[PDB]
Amino acid sequence: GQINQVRPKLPLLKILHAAGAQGEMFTVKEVMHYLGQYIMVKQLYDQQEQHMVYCGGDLLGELLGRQSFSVKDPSPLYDMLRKNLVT
Numbered sequence: 001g002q003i004n005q006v007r008p009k010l011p012l013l014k015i016l017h018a019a020g021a022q023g024e025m026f027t028v029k030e031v032m033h034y035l036g037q038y039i040m041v042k043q044l045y046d047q048q049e050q051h052m053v054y055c056g057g058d059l060l061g062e063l064l065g066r067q068s069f070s071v072k073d074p075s076p077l078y079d080m081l082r083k084n085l086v087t
């Protein structure tokens with residue numbers, strides 16, 4: 001209630017749930033932690049070049065409107081969160 005920060009929209013929430021999350025309310029940090037785990041279980045990163053994520057062809061790619069991105073550039077993630085996180 002008071003410890004949580006956001007309620008995610010159904011597409012982002014379906015992803016968070018696929019990563020092992022339960023419920024509807026989260027901190028921002030949780031959301032990012034679950035997206036990190038999602039990327040890892042579905043093997044979206046390059047094992048030989050960790051900072052590159054390949055999300056094209058996955059629900060996450062659709063949601064970010066991208067094929068791939070470097071984790072060194074917050075941009076497409078932060079922008080996606082602003083559109084999918086209800087405060």
Ligand SMILES: C[C@@H](c1ccc(Cl)cc1Cl)n1cnc(-c2ccccc2)c1-c1c(C(=O)Nc2cc(C(=O)O)ccc2N2CCC(N3CCCOC3=O)CC2)[nH]c2cc(Cl)ccc12
Pocket residue numbers: 032033034035036037039040045050051053071072073074077078
């Ligand atoms: C800083 C962070 C990041 C980078 C960018 C942004 Cl915008 C936000 C964020 Cl918190 N990070 C760095 N590398 C990845 C990332 C990179 C590739 C795949 C998955 C996640 C991530 C991501 C996390 C995440 O929570 N990371 C994380 C957070 C913490 C912490 O809060 O104290 C500690 C350790 C962390 N990581 C665990 C897996 C490790 N990892 C990656 C694969 C190889 O093995 C491995 O141990 C790499 C570090 N979440 C994400 C979500 C998305 Cl959409 C994209 C990337 C990440």
Ligand code: NA
Pocket residue numbers: 042043044
């Ligand atoms: Na994959």
